[PDB]
Every structure is written in C-alpha cells, then in structure tokens.
PDB file of C-alpha atoms and ligand atoms in Angstrom:
ATOM      1  CA  UNK A  12       0.000   0.000   0.000  1.00 47.37           C
ATOM      2  CA  UNK A  13       1.905   3.015   1.371  1.00 47.27           C
ATOM      3  CA  UNK A  14       5.485   2.754   2.628  1.00 46.17           C
ATOM      4  CA  UNK A  15       7.203   5.253   4.915  1.00 47.29           C
ATOM      5  CA  UNK A  16      10.978   5.592   4.620  1.00 46.22           C
ATOM      6  CA  UNK A  17      13.294   7.719   6.738  1.00 46.64           C
ATOM      7  CA  UNK A  18      16.450   9.748   6.167  1.00 44.22           C
ATOM      8  CA  UNK A  19      18.345  10.597   9.369  1.00 44.84           C
ATOM      9  CA  UNK A  20      20.278  13.842   8.796  1.00 44.07           C
ATOM     10  CA  UNK A  21      22.983  14.988  11.237  1.00 43.85           C
ATOM     11  CA  UNK A  22      23.698  18.593  12.033  1.00 42.96           C
ATOM     12  CA  UNK A  23      27.209  18.264  13.382  1.00 43.84           C
ATOM     13  CA  UNK A  24      30.897  19.096  13.092  1.00 44.82           C
ATOM     14  CA  UNK A  25      33.874  16.709  13.015  1.00 41.43           C
ATOM     15  CA  UNK A  26      34.185  14.444  16.041  1.00 41.68           C
ATOM     16  CA  UNK A  27      30.687  14.935  17.468  1.00 41.60           C
ATOM     17  CA  UNK A  28      30.187  11.172  17.274  1.00 40.97           C
ATOM     18  CA  UNK A  29      28.101  10.850  14.077  1.00 43.02           C
ATOM     19  CA  UNK A  30      29.811   7.706  12.830  1.00 43.45           C
ATOM     20  CA  UNK A  31      29.893   6.143  16.299  1.00 48.04           C
ATOM     21  CA  UNK A  32      26.175   6.799  16.870  1.00 47.99           C
ATOM     22  CA  UNK A  33      25.194   5.622  13.392  1.00 46.10           C
ATOM     23  CA  UNK A  34      27.379   2.501  13.601  1.00 47.91           C
ATOM     24  CA  UNK A  35      25.776   1.649  16.966  1.00 46.11           C
ATOM     25  CA  UNK A  36      22.311   2.051  15.453  1.00 47.53           C
ATOM     26  CA  UNK A  37      23.223  -0.105  12.443  1.00 48.51           C
ATOM     27  CA  UNK A  38      24.673  -2.797  14.744  1.00 46.81           C
ATOM     28  CA  UNK A  39      21.281  -2.840  16.506  1.00 46.06           C
ATOM     29  CA  UNK A  40      19.239  -2.567  13.278  1.00 44.81           C
ATOM     30  CA  UNK A  41      21.168  -4.342  10.508  1.00 42.26           C
ATOM     31  CA  UNK A  42      18.410  -3.624   7.965  1.00 40.32           C
ATOM     32  CA  UNK A  43      19.140   0.121   8.161  1.00 38.70           C
ATOM     33  CA  UNK A  44      21.529   1.597   5.593  1.00 40.28           C
ATOM     34  CA  UNK A  45      24.514   3.649   6.775  1.00 39.59           C
ATOM     35  CA  UNK A  46      25.941   5.784   3.951  1.00 40.77           C
ATOM     36  CA  UNK A  47      29.244   7.421   4.886  1.00 40.35           C
ATOM     37  CA  UNK A  48      30.167  10.575   2.956  1.00 41.21           C
ATOM     38  CA  UNK A  49      33.788  10.071   4.054  1.00 40.27           C
ATOM     39  CA  UNK A  50      33.867   6.750   2.177  1.00 43.40           C
ATOM     40  CA  UNK A  51      32.684   8.301  -1.128  1.00 43.21           C
ATOM     41  CA  UNK A  52      35.323   9.465  -3.610  1.00 39.21           C
ATOM     42  CA  UNK A  53      35.014  13.191  -4.337  1.00 43.81           C
ATOM     43  CA  UNK A  54      34.806  12.144  -8.001  1.00 44.21           C
ATOM     44  CA  UNK A  55      32.358   9.242  -7.596  1.00 44.26           C
ATOM     45  CA  UNK A  56      29.637   9.157 -10.238  1.00 42.65           C
ATOM     46  CA  UNK A  57      26.992   8.455  -7.576  1.00 40.75           C
ATOM     47  CA  UNK A  58      27.175  10.887  -4.653  1.00 39.88           C
ATOM     48  CA  UNK A  59      25.586  10.530  -1.228  1.00 39.81           C
ATOM     49  CA  UNK A  60      22.186  11.849  -2.307  1.00 39.05           C
ATOM     50  CA  UNK A  61      22.168   9.386  -5.241  1.00 38.77           C
ATOM     51  CA  UNK A  62      23.198   6.463  -3.025  1.00 39.55           C
ATOM     52  CA  UNK A  63      20.474   7.445  -0.555  1.00 41.55           C
ATOM     53  CA  UNK A  64      17.742   7.230  -3.182  1.00 42.49           C
ATOM     54  CA  UNK A  65      19.272   4.063  -4.614  1.00 46.29           C
ATOM     55  CA  UNK A  66      19.024   2.494  -1.152  1.00 45.97           C
ATOM     56  CA  UNK A  67      15.396   3.497  -0.612  1.00 48.79           C
ATOM     57  CA  UNK A  68      14.331   1.653  -3.785  1.00 47.98           C
ATOM     58  CA  UNK A  69      14.110  -1.780  -2.160  1.00 41.23           C
ATOM     59  CA  UNK A  70      11.134  -2.765  -0.059  1.00 41.61           C
ATOM     60  CA  UNK A  71      14.000  -4.169   2.025  1.00 42.51           C
ATOM     61  CA  UNK A  72      15.333  -0.760   2.955  1.00 40.98           C
ATOM     62  CA  UNK A  73      13.453   1.890   4.926  1.00 39.07           C
ATOM     63  CA  UNK A  74      16.110   3.908   6.847  1.00 39.23           C
ATOM     64  CA  UNK A  75      19.141   5.804   5.512  1.00 40.16           C
ATOM     65  CA  UNK A  76      21.618   7.084   8.084  1.00 40.41           C
ATOM     66  CA  UNK A  77      22.967  10.033   6.050  1.00 40.68           C
ATOM     67  CA  UNK A  78      26.461  10.319   7.568  1.00 42.80           C
ATOM     68  CA  UNK A  79      27.708  13.839   6.754  1.00 40.50           C
ATOM     69  CA  UNK A  80      28.233  16.916   8.928  1.00 40.62           C
ATOM     70  CA  UNK A  81      25.785  19.355   7.289  1.00 41.64           C
ATOM     71  CA  UNK A  82      27.138  22.077   9.580  1.00 42.55           C
ATOM     72  CA  UNK A  83      26.070  24.764   7.066  1.00 42.15           C
ATOM     73  CA  UNK A  84      22.444  25.508   6.231  1.00 41.72           C
ATOM     74  CA  UNK A  85      23.197  25.213   2.497  1.00 40.86           C
ATOM     75  CA  UNK A  86      24.161  21.576   3.133  1.00 40.81           C
ATOM     76  CA  UNK A  87      20.726  20.804   4.558  1.00 39.03           C
ATOM     77  CA  UNK A  88      19.169  22.723   1.652  1.00 39.16           C
ATOM     78  CA  UNK A  89      21.101  20.537  -0.811  1.00 39.59           C
ATOM     79  CA  UNK A  90      19.637  17.385   0.748  1.00 38.82           C
ATOM     80  CA  UNK A  91      16.007  18.520   0.552  1.00 37.12           C
ATOM     81  CA  UNK A  92      16.300  19.985  -2.944  1.00 39.14           C
ATOM     82  CA  UNK A  93      18.327  17.142  -4.476  1.00 41.23           C
ATOM     83  CA  UNK A  94      16.216  14.328  -3.009  1.00 41.78           C
ATOM     84  CA  UNK A  95      13.013  16.185  -3.860  1.00 41.93           C
ATOM     85  CA  UNK A  96      13.870  16.652  -7.511  1.00 42.25           C
ATOM     86  CA  UNK A  97      15.411  13.193  -8.094  1.00 40.11           C
ATOM     87  CA  UNK A  98      13.137  10.895  -6.079  1.00 39.96           C
ATOM     88  CA  UNK A  99      10.749  10.248  -8.990  1.00 36.31           C
ATOM     89  CA  UNK A 100      13.659   8.655 -10.860  1.00 33.02           C
ATOM     90  CA  UNK A 101      13.803   5.976  -8.129  1.00 36.21           C
ATOM     91  CA  UNK A 102      10.573   5.778  -6.089  1.00 35.82           C
ATOM     92  CA  UNK A 103       6.935   5.310  -7.058  1.00 35.01           C
ATOM     93  CA  UNK A 104       4.330   7.678  -5.623  1.00 36.28           C
ATOM     94  CA  UNK A 105       3.344   5.318  -2.783  1.00 37.26           C
ATOM     95  CA  UNK A 106       6.605   5.958  -0.883  1.00 37.60           C
ATOM     96  CA  UNK A 107       6.428   8.707   1.755  1.00 35.10           C
ATOM     97  CA  UNK A 108       9.850  10.108   2.730  1.00 35.91           C
ATOM     98  CA  UNK A 109      10.385  11.638   6.166  1.00 38.18           C
ATOM     99  CA  UNK A 110      13.438  13.698   7.147  1.00 38.25           C
ATOM    100  CA  UNK A 111      14.600  13.438  10.767  1.00 38.00           C
ATOM    101  CA  UNK A 112      17.272  15.887  11.885  1.00 36.69           C
ATOM    102  CA  UNK A 113      19.723  14.491  14.436  1.00 34.37           C
ATOM    103  CA  UNK A 114      21.049  17.571  16.234  1.00 35.13           C
ATOM    104  CA  UNK A 115      24.528  16.871  17.606  1.00 36.28           C
ATOM    105  CA  UNK A 116      25.347  20.378  18.890  1.00 36.82           C
ATOM    106  CA  UNK A 117      23.124  21.688  21.711  1.00 35.07           C
ATOM    107  CA  UNK A 118      21.885  25.237  21.219  1.00 34.35           C
ATOM    108  CA  UNK A 119      23.500  26.468  24.468  1.00 33.80           C
ATOM    109  CA  UNK A 120      26.894  24.872  23.812  1.00 37.08           C
ATOM    110  CA  UNK A 121      29.665  27.422  23.408  1.00 37.44           C
ATOM    111  CA  UNK A 122      32.055  27.207  20.480  1.00 36.50           C
ATOM    112  CA  UNK A 123      34.853  26.861  23.050  1.00 36.95           C
ATOM    113  CA  UNK A 124      33.247  23.782  24.597  1.00 36.49           C
ATOM    114  CA  UNK A 125      32.445  22.341  21.169  1.00 39.03           C
ATOM    115  CA  UNK A 126      36.107  22.695  20.217  1.00 39.11           C
ATOM    116  CA  UNK A 127      37.481  21.339  23.507  1.00 39.52           C
ATOM    117  CA  UNK A 128      35.298  18.214  23.319  1.00 40.08           C
ATOM    118  CA  UNK A 129      35.690  17.415  19.618  1.00 42.49           C
ATOM    119  CA  UNK A 130      39.376  18.345  19.324  1.00 39.50           C
ATOM    120  CA  UNK A 131      40.329  16.123  22.242  1.00 40.58           C
ATOM    121  CA  UNK A 132      38.275  13.260  20.766  1.00 42.49           C
ATOM    122  CA  UNK A 133      39.890  13.541  17.338  1.00 41.99           C
ATOM    123  CA  UNK A 134      43.533  13.875  18.363  1.00 38.62           C
ATOM    124  CA  UNK A 135      43.020  11.010  20.858  1.00 38.50           C
ATOM    125  CA  UNK A 136      51.699  18.778   9.548  1.00 39.40           C
ATOM    126  CA  UNK A 137      48.918  16.181   9.549  1.00 36.02           C
ATOM    127  CA  UNK A 138      47.902  17.503  12.963  1.00 39.42           C
ATOM    128  CA  UNK A 139      47.730  21.024  11.523  1.00 40.50           C
ATOM    129  CA  UNK A 140      45.746  19.611   8.603  1.00 39.84           C
ATOM    130  CA  UNK A 141      43.192  17.893  10.837  1.00 39.60           C
ATOM    131  CA  UNK A 142      42.911  21.027  12.978  1.00 38.11           C
ATOM    132  CA  UNK A 143      42.310  23.405  10.065  1.00 35.66           C
ATOM    133  CA  UNK A 144      39.708  21.083   8.497  1.00 36.48           C
ATOM    134  CA  UNK A 145      37.905  20.877  11.855  1.00 37.14           C
ATOM    135  CA  UNK A 146      37.994  24.687  12.081  1.00 38.42           C
ATOM    136  CA  UNK A 147      36.421  24.952   8.614  1.00 41.22           C
ATOM    137  CA  UNK A 148      33.320  22.962   9.573  1.00 40.86           C
ATOM    138  CA  UNK A 149      32.933  24.977  12.776  1.00 42.01           C
ATOM    139  CA  UNK A 150      33.428  28.254  10.907  1.00 39.21           C
ATOM    140  CA  UNK A 151      30.587  27.330   8.555  1.00 38.43           C
ATOM    141  CA  UNK A 152      28.337  25.954  11.322  1.00 39.02           C
ATOM    142  CA  UNK A 153      24.821  27.413  11.366  1.00 35.88           C
ATOM    143  CA  UNK A 154      22.593  25.962  14.116  1.00 38.54           C
ATOM    144  CA  UNK A 155      19.350  24.252  13.180  1.00 39.51           C
ATOM    145  CA  UNK A 156      16.463  26.711  12.843  1.00 41.14           C
ATOM    146  CA  UNK A 157      13.110  25.125  12.052  1.00 41.42           C
ATOM    147  CA  UNK A 158      11.373  28.534  11.930  1.00 41.67           C
ATOM    148  CA  UNK A 159      12.780  29.226   8.447  1.00 44.83           C
ATOM    149  CA  UNK A 160      14.128  27.688   5.264  1.00 46.38           C
ATOM    150  CA  UNK A 161      15.678  25.123   4.853  1.00 45.62           C
ATOM    151  CA  UNK A 162      15.399  23.401   8.260  1.00 44.67           C
ATOM    152  CA  UNK A 163      11.640  23.940   8.354  1.00 45.37           C
ATOM    153  CA  UNK A 164      11.464  20.995   5.933  1.00 46.07           C
ATOM    154  CA  UNK A 165      12.465  18.507   8.657  1.00 44.33           C
ATOM    155  CA  UNK A 166       9.603  16.304   9.836  1.00 48.03           C
ATOM    156  CA  UNK A 167      11.169  15.953  13.277  1.00 48.63           C
ATOM    157  CA  UNK A 168      14.290  16.906  15.228  1.00 48.60           C
ATOM    158  CA  UNK A 169      16.061  14.725  17.788  1.00 45.98           C
ATOM    159  CA  UNK A 170      18.142  16.812  20.199  1.00 44.40           C
ATOM    160  CA  UNK A 171      21.313  15.101  21.401  1.00 45.38           C
ATOM    161  CA  UNK A 172      23.668  15.924  24.242  1.00 45.94           C
ATOM    162  CA  UNK A 173      27.304  16.935  23.818  1.00 46.57           C
ATOM    163  CA  UNK A 174      29.216  16.688  27.067  1.00 45.38           C
ATOM    164  CA  UNK A 175      32.390  15.535  28.650  1.00 49.76           C
ATOM    165  CA  UNK A 176      31.728  11.954  29.653  1.00 47.13           C
ATOM    166  CA  UNK A 177      30.406  11.835  33.219  1.00 45.02           C
ATOM    167  CA  UNK A 178      29.723   8.894  35.534  1.00 44.89           C
ATOM    168  CA  UNK A 179      31.556   6.584  33.106  1.00 46.43           C
ATOM    169  CA  UNK A 180      28.759   7.069  30.534  1.00 47.94           C
ATOM    170  CA  UNK A 181      29.909   8.047  27.044  1.00 50.14           C
ATOM    171  CA  UNK A 182      27.993  10.960  25.548  1.00 51.22           C
ATOM    172  CA  UNK A 183      27.383   9.029  22.313  1.00 48.42           C
ATOM    173  CA  UNK A 184      25.928   6.053  24.218  1.00 47.68           C
ATOM    174  CA  UNK A 185      23.496   8.355  25.997  1.00 45.89           C
ATOM    175  CA  UNK A 186      22.639   9.775  22.551  1.00 46.29           C
ATOM    176  CA  UNK A 187      21.961   6.322  21.097  1.00 43.43           C
ATOM    177  CA  UNK A 188      19.498   5.778  23.951  1.00 43.39           C
ATOM    178  CA  UNK A 189      17.929   9.213  23.347  1.00 41.41           C
ATOM    179  CA  UNK A 190      17.382   8.424  19.654  1.00 39.79           C
ATOM    180  CA  UNK A 191      15.847   4.997  20.365  1.00 41.70           C
ATOM    181  CA  UNK A 192      13.498   6.380  23.029  1.00 41.86           C
ATOM    182  CA  UNK A 193      12.483   9.288  20.779  1.00 42.22           C
ATOM    183  CA  UNK A 194      11.693   6.982  17.851  1.00 44.84           C
ATOM    184  CA  UNK A 195       9.699   4.574  20.034  1.00 45.38           C
ATOM    185  CA  UNK A 196       7.589   7.521  21.182  1.00 43.35           C
ATOM    186  CA  UNK A 197       7.259   9.474  17.922  1.00 44.08           C
ATOM    187  CA  UNK A 198       7.552   6.841  15.154  1.00 49.43           C
ATOM    188  CA  UNK A 199       6.336   3.694  16.918  1.00 51.52           C
ATOM    189  CA  UNK A 200       6.001   1.735  13.664  1.00 49.81           C
ATOM    190  CA  UNK A 201       9.747   2.034  12.956  1.00 49.00           C
ATOM    191  CA  UNK A 202      11.103   0.256  16.060  1.00 50.74           C
ATOM    192  CA  UNK A 203       8.268  -1.691  17.664  1.00 54.05           C
ATOM    193  CA  UNK A 204       9.841  -2.477  21.044  1.00 51.03           C
ATOM    194  CA  UNK A 205      13.234  -1.244  22.297  1.00 52.96           C
ATOM    195  CA  UNK A 206      16.278  -3.524  22.208  1.00 51.44           C
ATOM    196  CA  UNK A 207      17.533  -4.691  25.589  1.00 50.02           C
ATOM    197  CA  UNK A 208      19.875  -2.235  27.295  1.00 49.07           C
ATOM    198  CA  UNK A 209      22.725  -4.763  27.425  1.00 49.45           C
ATOM    199  CA  UNK A 210      22.403  -5.209  23.652  1.00 48.84           C
ATOM    200  CA  UNK A 211      22.581  -1.445  23.123  1.00 46.79           C
ATOM    201  CA  UNK A 212      25.700  -1.366  25.325  1.00 44.64           C
ATOM    202  CA  UNK A 213      27.365  -4.191  23.373  1.00 45.28           C
ATOM    203  CA  UNK A 214      26.481  -2.614  20.031  1.00 46.16           C
ATOM    204  CA  UNK A 215      27.947   0.680  21.244  1.00 51.14           C
ATOM    205  CA  UNK A 216      31.101  -1.051  22.539  1.00 50.04           C
ATOM    206  CA  UNK A 217      31.572  -2.536  19.059  1.00 50.85           C
ATOM    207  CA  UNK A 218      31.267   0.901  17.446  1.00 52.76           C
ATOM    208  CA  UNK A 219      33.301   2.739  20.088  1.00 55.23           C
ATOM    209  CA  UNK A 220      36.252   0.327  19.853  1.00 55.53           C
ATOM    210  CA  UNK A 221      36.198   0.336  16.045  1.00 55.42           C
ATOM    211  CA  UNK A 222      39.654   1.197  14.717  1.00 51.68           C
TER     212      UNK A 222
HETATM  213  N1  GDP B  29      35.279   9.942  25.007  1.00 50.61           N
HETATM  214  C1  GDP B  29      34.344   9.804  24.025  1.00 50.61           C
HETATM  215  N2  GDP B  29      34.769   9.527  22.777  1.00 50.61           N
HETATM  216  C2  GDP B  29      33.853   9.382  21.781  1.00 50.61           C
HETATM  217  C3  GDP B  29      32.421   9.527  22.063  1.00 50.61           C
HETATM  218  N3  GDP B  29      31.761   9.328  20.897  1.00 50.61           N
HETATM  219  C4  GDP B  29      32.716   9.071  19.949  1.00 50.61           C
HETATM  220  N4  GDP B  29      33.959   9.087  20.498  1.00 50.61           N
HETATM  221  C5  GDP B  29      35.265   8.909  19.837  1.00 50.61           C
HETATM  222  O1  GDP B  29      35.549  10.183  19.256  1.00 50.61           O
HETATM  223  C6  GDP B  29      36.161  10.022  17.982  1.00 50.61           C
HETATM  224  C7  GDP B  29      35.272  10.670  16.927  1.00 50.61           C
HETATM  225  O2  GDP B  29      34.005  10.009  16.898  1.00 50.61           O
HETATM  226  P1  GDP B  29      33.275   9.841  15.482  1.00 50.61           P
HETATM  227  O3  GDP B  29      32.054   8.976  15.686  1.00 50.61           O
HETATM  228  O4  GDP B  29      34.241   9.266  14.473  1.00 50.61           O
HETATM  229  O5  GDP B  29      32.908  11.354  15.129  1.00 50.61           O
HETATM  230  P2  GDP B  29      32.449  11.892  13.668  1.00 50.61           P
HETATM  231  O6  GDP B  29      33.564  12.675  13.053  1.00 50.61           O
HETATM  232  O7  GDP B  29      31.305  12.841  13.970  1.00 50.61           O
HETATM  233  O8  GDP B  29      31.963  10.778  12.806  1.00 50.61           O
HETATM  234  C8  GDP B  29      36.310   8.529  17.755  1.00 50.61           C
HETATM  235  O9  GDP B  29      37.649   8.174  18.132  1.00 50.61           O
HETATM  236  C9  GDP B  29      35.283   7.919  18.692  1.00 50.61           C
HETATM  237  O10 GDP B  29      35.634   6.608  19.150  1.00 50.61           O
HETATM  238  C10 GDP B  29      32.045   9.827  23.453  1.00 50.61           C
HETATM  239  O11 GDP B  29      30.850   9.984  23.791  1.00 50.61           O
HETATM  240  N5  GDP B  29      33.042   9.950  24.340  1.00 50.61           N
HETATM  241 MG1   MG B  30      32.659  10.101  10.869  1.00 47.94          MG
END
C-alpha cells in the first residue's frame, strides 16, 4: 500500500560522534543503511544523495543514516532539494519520505566547549591539517532553525547531548538511547519495542572500539 521511509540527517561538526552513533544504530538494526560521505570518492559518479535514493528503492530498505556533517544551512538545503527533484527517478508515488534531523550540537553549547570536546576526541603537519579542516566545519556551522528555510522541511528533530563523559557514561551512548526512546515515542512503527539495554551497550562497545 503506502510505505514510509526515513532519512536521518545529522547537524554536526567533526568528532561529534556521528559515525559512532550511526554505527551503533546499524549494529542494533542491521536492515538500516549507513551511507558514509567520508567513504565516497570526491569524483564518484553516484554521490551521497544518489546512493540514498538508490538504497530506498528496495522494499528491504526503509532507513538511511545520512552520515555527513551538514554544519552549514546550504548543506541541509542541498539534501532537501536534491532528493526532492530526483526521487521520482527511483521511487513510485506510494513511498512517503520523512526527514529526521539528528542535532549533535546543543543550542546552548559554546564554540569553546564544542572545540574542547571534539578536538580532544579527534587527536586522541597532519595535525595542523586535521585542525584546520575541523575549524572549517565549525566556521561554517549554522545551528538548526526550524522557523525558516531550509530546516523547516524537517519532519522531526532529535536533540542530542554533547558533554564531557560523566559517571563513566559516554555521551554518544546516551545519545543512542535518546534516539531509540524518541523513535519509540514518535515513530512507533519504525522500532516496535526497544532492544535490551545490554544489547545497546554491546552494540555501542563494538562501534566505540572500532579502529
Ligand atoms: N570519550 C568519548 N569519545 C567518543 C564519544 N563518541 C565518539 N567518540 C570517539 O571520538 C572520535 C570521533 O568520533 P566519530 O564517531 O568518528 O565522530 P564523527 O567525526 O562525527 O563521525 C572517535 O575516536 C570515537 O571513538 C564519546 O561519547 N566519548
Ligand atoms: Mg565520521
């Protein structure tokens, strides 16, 4: 009849834990599709928006974890505009697409704290290179604003934490739990009942200790 598919869109900078969070989710939900912009050649014929629509063709596949920073508003605009104009190449008219923003940078977080947390995660000439690339994404960062274009096209926003780890609880593991609880409440057809907490912890351990 009618199928609902989902595209999870981060708003993040480097080192906020996007890949760790998305890998944890995909370990829990192997049927979801994790597309990593960092794995795509900057001269690939099919770019991330193309691979996203390619994935959503199968009745198999209903979730794309769109793994890219999108720190700048123009990068969110690209997603909405490109998917909107190309989806009829791939999907029939019975497929409803929903866009879920995954906000990695709390609105009250200072740029200083954002830098301290992410820079220490990433380091822990090539150092200068990593640092200046990280500074570029932060320089371009425009916080999510659903009161105006383009972020008003999101169907839903999940607000994550970004903290120093406290009480031996990794920030990204807390965020995995936040996402699961939010989806169970707001999109109950997607995940029917929550995975066991020990399974979430193991799936996060796998992602965290990925080298
Ligand atoms: N201490 C700590 N490290 C984390 C956390 N989340 C991710 N990391 C680590 O921080 C680094 C960057 O995480 P990653 O998921 O690759 O960030 P990305 O650039 O947004 O994809 C990796 O070495 C992760 O293992 C966290 O909550 N706490
Ligand atoms: Mg990454």
